[PDB]
Symmetry: C3
Subunit: 114 residues, 3 copies
């Protein structure tokens, strides 16, 4: 799985250890080993949500499976929780796009996951 | 809706007010309330289009519905027009990927839109 | 086609000529003329792969057709090979998400590719 968060919160406001926390929590949530979890945090962005530049985040979770209505509700609670606690972003200023990737549409280690 | 633009145009070349202009015009074009429109502009990027590093942009528009051939044509005219007028990017140097998101695949405010 | 690499490798480690090399090789791999290939490299990112921050990359390749299991295996060999040779990223620390875009879902030059 791969999780990306783009935010206007400044770099100094991202706590040390945040990448590791995301990795651990996403390994637990998705059920996948942490070795297969990739995380990417992009602070200091020029962005707005609802016309406002108060803190916000635009995120993506890509996984081969482990994506669906109920799972995505749980992921949203988890990840909005983390973003609120760690980055002080209101959950109602977070969008998370979920992508259920076909194995053959993910490249890794010179080939695909098919 | 979520609109992201990545460009090699420099930050100083992005006019004041641009994120609000985008928000307003996207709310109108998609029919969605402005409170649901997110916009993100990423200048000073290392990119090329057709092998050239003249001004260009790589963009995405995600929406829960309001995506299709005629709508996307309309969006492209709008957005290429704004990138040309405001960022001086030629329309033939812009790619915009459109995504029709299922409501269950968009997280927001601790849950999804499903 | 549009290729985007996000990596923690520092900008100074991206060799001169890299965007052109990507453009040339992708034109060739996809069979599409280089005038239609866009490339984007984002260095200096805050990311982790498998819980660690050695060099890694998170990438995407979007194309109107030319996407499928065999083709994507070919692309992954090519692109991991370039990322290893030029950026010294291990192929096992690269993910590439592949997207087969419908022509009507790609904006360009004030309209779509439909």
């Amino acid at each position: 799985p791969m999780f990306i968060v783009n935010t206007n919160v400044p770099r100094a406001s991202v706590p040390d250890g945040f990448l590791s926390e995301l990795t651990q929590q996403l390994a637990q949530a998705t059920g996948k080993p942490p070795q297969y979890i990739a995380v990417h945090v992009v602070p200091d962005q020029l962005m707005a949500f609802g016309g406002s530049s108060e803190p916000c985040a635009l995120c993506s979770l890509h996984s081969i499976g482990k994506i669906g209505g109920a799972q995505n509700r749980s992921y949203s609670k988890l990840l909005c929780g983390l973003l609120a606690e760690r980055l002080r972003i209101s959950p109602d200023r977070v969008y998370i796009n979920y992508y259920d990737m076909n194995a053959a549409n993910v490249g890794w280690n010179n080939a695909t996951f098919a």
